[PDB]
UniProtKB/Swiss-Prot annotation, chain C:
Residues 3-28 are annotated as: Disordered. Residues 10-30 are annotated as: Fusion peptide 2. The chain holds residues 826 to 874 of 1273 of the full protein. Changing residue 31 to K: In strain: Omicron/BA.1. Disulfide bonds join 15-26. This is Spike protein S2'. Subunit of the fusion protein that is processed upon entry into the host cell. Mediates fusion of the virion and cellular membranes by functioning as a class I viral fusion protein. Contains a viral fusion peptide that is unmasked after S2 cleavage. This cleavage can occur at the cell membrane by host TMPRSS2 or during endocytosis by host CSTL. In either case, this triggers an extensive and irreversible conformational change that leads to fusion of the viral envelope with the cellular cytoplasmic membrane, releasing viral genomic RNA into the host cell cytoplasm. It comes from Severe acute respiratory syndrome coronavirus 2 (2019-nCoV).
From Swiss-Prot, chain F:
Attaches the virion to the cell membrane by interacting with host receptor, initiating the infection. The major receptor is host ACE2. When S2/S2' has been cleaved, binding to the receptor triggers direct fusion at the cell membrane. When S2/S2' has not been cleaved, binding to the receptor results in internalization of the virus by endocytosis using host TFRC and GRM2 and leading to fusion of the virion membrane with the host endosomal membrane. Alternatively, may use NRP1/NRP2 and integrin as entry receptors. It comes from Severe acute respiratory syndrome coronavirus 2 (2019-nCoV). The gene is S. Changing residue 28 to T: In strain: Gamma/P.1. This is Spike protein S1. Changing residue 28 to N: In strain: Beta/B.1.351, Omicron/BA.1, Omicron/BA.2, Omicron/BA.2.12.1, Omicron/BA.2.75, Omicron/BA.4, Omicron/BA.5, Omicron/BQ.1.1, Omicron/XBB.1.5, Omicron/EG.5.1; May enhance affinity to human ACE2 receptor. The chain holds residues 390 to 437 of 1273 of the full protein. Residues 14-16 are annotated as: Integrin-binding motif. It comes from the Viruses. Binds to host ACE2. RBD also interacts with the N-linked glycan on 'Asn-90' of ACE2. Cleavage of S generates a polybasic C-terminal sequence on S1 that binds to host Neuropilin-1 (NRP1) and Neuropilin-2 (NRP2) receptors. Interacts with host integrin alpha-5/beta-1 (ITGA5:ITGB1) and with ACE2 in complex with integrin alpha-5/beta-1 (ITGA5:ITGB1). May interact via cytoplasmic c-terminus with M protein. May interact (via N-terminus) with host bilirubin and biliverdin, thereby preventing antibody binding to the SARS-CoV-2 spike NTD via an allosteric mechanism.
Length: 384, 49, 49, 263, 48, 48
């Protein structure tokens, strides 16, 4: 309602002693949103990824790059065709609100029981010997039964796994090699021997197989986020760009509240975000106009309320501490702020102290003894 | 004789420009306040000293 | 003795652009950490002295 | 085509002190007026790099280990260092990576390659027209399963010149991490006769290749009737990265300007 | 948490997953202030 | 245990969509015809 009621609320009391009290900070709120993404138009070629005529074997998993295009992950995520669409560093709803640096689709076929092994941290002959994800994988694993697309009644032996290996393979390693594996302690030469094996095996994929024993196509999407100049984005239009005003910006999924400004920070070509000592972004390259914008948070400070006792008077004065007055009147309640009571914006008795802008108290030339201390040599009192 | 008076807004230190975080910090209750009373007690004492 | 942030007013022109980068005081203030002024100025202490 | 180029002299193996070189920008983020502590595969300060050279008489192009990644650099004139082979078997039992800067384009390719025992590229020298002409590409005899390929937009790069000291230092860092092969690099102009220059400068990131192979070793490619030839003089240095903690200083303009090797 | 930056969590995660990451940052940040205010209450007694 | 007011919501869906009836979920059922609140107290019961 008013600064006195806010102190009554902050002290949890209906009556307030004479004093100066701290209350919730004023903070200038976003005037409008800004959104900025690269001005690319063509959609991502998912018809060649998900609707290719034939997929690769899991021993020889194909890796396709997605770049210089616009994504629409709602076309994928809302489709009932996917038996699994599991994300590991994002929620699937946020993919349309977000930007991606480099994006690789890993395409292959496995048994339906093995979809559980494609996730990061997993193990078993697929995860150990032909397709490993890193522990800190950011991306999503997408799978569907391709039984009707790819399976024949004798068995489509074109799809192969790796059953044998001298060591487990590294994250995103691909092993094509057809070297014979010796499970016996004896070495072996030529093509074959006892307890000696060709390291690959074909699946017996038939449409008469039980569910789980049927073929599943998999796409793993393996993007990296928010740290580098993007090349793929969600289907959101850029707004116009404005400067020297408080806004809710979003640069390539870097959402935040701030005032933008034309920076002299010399980014080298590979950089898109600059960080502060607090590990927060304080400059960004705009993705449409290749210029560097300083980000600074909106004007704010503590609000101290100066009062005689409730037993004396309900009149109060407000110190906007650490602020130039210039800013107070800027703090016009025309738009949103943390505090609501914009009633004092009237002034005509305001004062610039070294402590901040003081409102609702009259500056008098006659010095008195200290009563309520304001700071930097200034004190307030309730007098005739 | 004295040291720099500091006021820290915990709500802005912890949940910087987020209402989602701010609504979670309310589940810790008095934690945001008791720190402001402690630092105000220190700050008031610098003028006393 | 080289003081840091005596509380005596901050105004964007000395906290963004050039004076945003080579500044710990700004890193502090942008995260809700504020340094308050003493009640007696360095002139008032010198009058008492 | 494949030949064992055998006309050379015998020297003992050389080494050199990598004073403060082989620091690179650890991530694609801007910082300035700050000291930043980071752990990565970095070249240890004052470490022994191995040293290699072309003379007149000398032409060392050996297979070298590639364990935890490599700092590579060359003090150079006349564009003699032209590429690298990376892989595990180097003989089409496995894949391998080829990088090569030929006369007109750069090429980057990943195959089950069958490489030559001594691989190189070759130039016809000062032959009547007063132009040096690239004419030999002795690197692979077969390339059986190409899972990655790139070739640059075309250019002409010169193949000629003679000077009493090297004019370029080109520096590189190579890392093969979680299926990604990462390159960082720097160019600086110089005037030095036969040593890796004492100084500091930081390598910017360049390219990041999704190659998915094991690299255990590597081999550089030099520019040169089938034997008896002149090697144009150039010198190159090989160091190994270690997982270490570095404190990196960014100046007011955001460039890594000095560094401390914590160990 | 998946990041130190409070907004990079909310840029990436919905209200179910974000609360798990955000409560980590609240827990550590709030412990950071209690450590600071304790050390400052102890220093204020040395200055007193 | 004791209950204040109790409402049974009765409807039919596809077996794949039973996953979408839970609180915090999304997809065309949870988005366009039956939404639970984030702080739902209660139980989801289903059979073919
Ligand atoms: C990338 O290639 C590396 C080299 O081919 C390979 O390392 C090799 O792994 C084998 C199998 O463990 C080792 O075989 C020998 O192991 C010890 C000595 O190290 C002996 O006791 C054994 O009898 C056997 O001979 C190789 O020594 C080893 N060589 C090297 C240089 O590492 C990596 O495993 C490969 N990486 C991936 C991800 O496949
Ligand atoms: C540097 O090495 C390059 C290979 O690594 C080499 O590229 C090759 O150049 C020839 C001639 O231009 C190409 O020949 C084909 O060119 C087109 C293809 O559509 C056709 O009109 C021709 O009839 C012929 O088939 C090769 O295909 C090309 N190789 C690759 C992989 O692109 C450069 O020529 C080399 N540059 C120098 C200066 O030596
Ligand atoms: C960041 O990069 C800046 C630009 O490269 C650089 O500023 C440049 O500094 C030099 C050396 O002081 C100036 O050189 C000129 O100085 C005066 C004019 O001010 C002339 O009388 C001289 O003959 C000489 O030409 C540049 O003028 C100046 N650049 C500009 C356009 O102002 C900074 O020094 C760099 N910062 C750091 C920390 O390295
Ligand atoms: C509050 O901000 C105003 C700027 O809006 C400051 O006024 C400037 O002061 C300098 C020095 O006297 C002049 O050279 C400028 O032309 C003034 N400009 C304007 C528009 O006022 C004022 O000094 C600030 N006050 C405090 C206490 O910081
Ligand atoms: C707040 C106030 O009334 N200040 C006055 C000022 O206006 C006047 O110019 C001065 C004359 O000495 O005395 C004081
Ligand atoms: C693939 O085709 C199916 C229909 O066969 C369609 O529903 C789906 O959207 C397509 N997906 C892509 C990525 O093209
Ligand atoms: C944005 O458009 C301008 C021309 O309108 C062009 O200069 C720029 O290249 C575009 N952005 C990108 C990322 O290409
Ligand atoms: C406050 O004022 C009321 C009269 O308005 C009086 O009854 C009461 O005693 C006073 N209390 C104090 C503490 O002054
Ligand atoms: C470098 O090599 C020399 C051999 O001349 C050796 O004495 C020295 O200890 C080596 N130093 C390092 C750091 O490897
Ligand atoms: C000079 O170049 C032409 C082609 O450009 C070639 O036919 C000729 O043989 C060359 N002459 C010599 C001496 O190398």
């Amino acid at each position: 309602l008013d600064p006195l009621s806010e102190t009554k609320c902050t002290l949890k009391s209906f009556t307030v002693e004479k004093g100066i009290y701290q209350t919730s900070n004023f903070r200038v709120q976003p005037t409008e949103s800004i959104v900025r993404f690269p001005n690319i138009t063509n959609l991502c070629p998912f018809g060649e990824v998900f609707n290719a005529t034939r997929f690769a074997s899991v021993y020889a998993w194909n890796r396709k790059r997605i770049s210089n295009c616009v994504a629409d992950y709602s076309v994928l995520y809302n489709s009932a065709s996917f038996s699994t669409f599991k994300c590991y560093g994002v929620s699937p709803t946020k993919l349309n609100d977000l930007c991606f640096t480099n994006v690789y689709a890993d395409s292959f076929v496995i048994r339906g029981d093995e979809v559980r092994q494609i996730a990061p941290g997993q193990t078993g002959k697929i995860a150990d010997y032909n397709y490993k994800l890193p522990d800190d994988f950011t991306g999503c694993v997408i799978a569907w039964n391709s039984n009707n697309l790819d399976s024949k009644v004798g068995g489509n032996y074109n799809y192969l796994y790796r059953l044998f290996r001298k060591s487990n393979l590294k994250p995103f390693e691909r092993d094509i090699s057809t070297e014979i594996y010796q499970a016996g302690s004896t070495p072996c030469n030529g093509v074959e021997g006892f307890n000696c094996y060709f390291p690959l095996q074909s699946y017996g994929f038939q449409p008469t197989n039980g569910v789980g024993y049927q073929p599943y196509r998999v796409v793993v999407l393996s993007f990296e986020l928010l740290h580098a100049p993007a090349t793929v984005c969600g289907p959101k239009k850029s707004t116009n760009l404005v400067k020297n005003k408080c806004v809710n910006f979003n640069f390539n999924g870097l959402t935040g509240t701030g005032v933008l400004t034309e920076s002299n920070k010399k980014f080298l070509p590979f950089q898109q975000f600059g960080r502060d000592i607090a590990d927060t972004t304080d400059a960004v390259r705009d993705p449409q106009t290749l210029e560097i914008l300083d980000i600074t948070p909106c004007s704010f400070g503590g609000v101290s309320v100066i009062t005689p006792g409730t037993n004396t008077s309900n009149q109060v004065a407000v110190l906007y501490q650490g602020v130039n007055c210039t800013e107070v009147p800027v703090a016009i309640h025309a738009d949103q702020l943390t505090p609501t009571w914009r009633v004092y914006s009237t002034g005509s008795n305001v004062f610039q102290t070294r402590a901040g802008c003081l409102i609702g108290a009259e500056h008098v030339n006659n010095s008195y003894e200290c009563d309520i201390p304001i700071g930097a040599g200034i004190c307030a009192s309730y007098q005739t | 004789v004295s040291m720099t008076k500091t006021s820290v807004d915990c709500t802005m230190y912890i949940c910087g420009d987020s209402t989602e975080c701010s609504n979670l910090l309310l589940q810790y209750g008095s934690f945001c306040t008791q720190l402001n009373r402690a630092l105000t007690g220190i700050a008031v004492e610098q003028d006393k000293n | 003795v080289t003081l840091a942030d005596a509380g005596f007013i901050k105004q964007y022109g000395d906290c963004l652009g050039d004076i945003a980068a080579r500044d710990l005081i700004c890193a502090q203030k942008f995260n809700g950490l504020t340094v308050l002024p003493p009640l007696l100025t360095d002139e008032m202490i010198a009058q008492y002295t | 085509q494949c030949v064992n180029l055998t006309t050379r002299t015998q020297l003992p193996p050389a080494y050199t002190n990598s004073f403060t070189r082989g620091v690179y920008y650890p991530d694609k983020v801007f910082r300035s007026s700050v000291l930043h502590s980071t752990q990565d595969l970095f070249l240890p300060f004052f470490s022994n790099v191995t040293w290699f050279h072309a003379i007149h008489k000398r032409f060392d192009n050996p297979v070298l280990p590639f364990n935890d990644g490599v700092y590579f650099a060359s003090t150079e004139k006349s564009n003699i260092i032209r590429g690298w082979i990376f892989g595990t078997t180097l003989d089409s039992k496995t894949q391998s990576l080829l990088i090569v800067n030929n006369a007109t384009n750069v090429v980057i390719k990943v195959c089950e390659f069958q490489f030559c025992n001594d691989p190189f590229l070759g130039v016809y020298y000062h032959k009547n027209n007063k132009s040096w002409m690239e004419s030999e590409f002795r690197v692979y005899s077969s390339a059986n399963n190409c899972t990655f390929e790139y070739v640059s937009q075309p250019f002409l790069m010169d193949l000629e010149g003679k000077q009493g000291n090297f004019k370029n230092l080109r520096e590189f860092v190579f890392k093969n991490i979680d299926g990604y092969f990462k390159i960082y690099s720097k160019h600086t102009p110089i005037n030095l006769v036969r040593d890796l220059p004492q100084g500091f400068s930081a390598l910017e990131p360049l390219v990041d290749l999704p190659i998915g192979i094991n690299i255990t070793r590597f081999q550089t490619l030099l520019a040169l009737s089938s034997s008896g030839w002149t090697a144009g003089a150039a010198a190159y240095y090989v160091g190994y990265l270690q997982p270490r903690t570095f404190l990196l200083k960014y100046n007011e303009n955001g460039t890594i300007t000095d560094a401390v090797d914590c160990a | 948490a998946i990041s130190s930056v409070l907004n990079d969590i909310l840029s990436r995660l919905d209200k179910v997953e974000a609360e798990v990451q955000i409560d980590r940052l609240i827990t550590g940040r709030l412990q950071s202030l209690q450590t600071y205010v304790t050390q400052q209450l102890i220093r204020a007694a040395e200055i007193r």
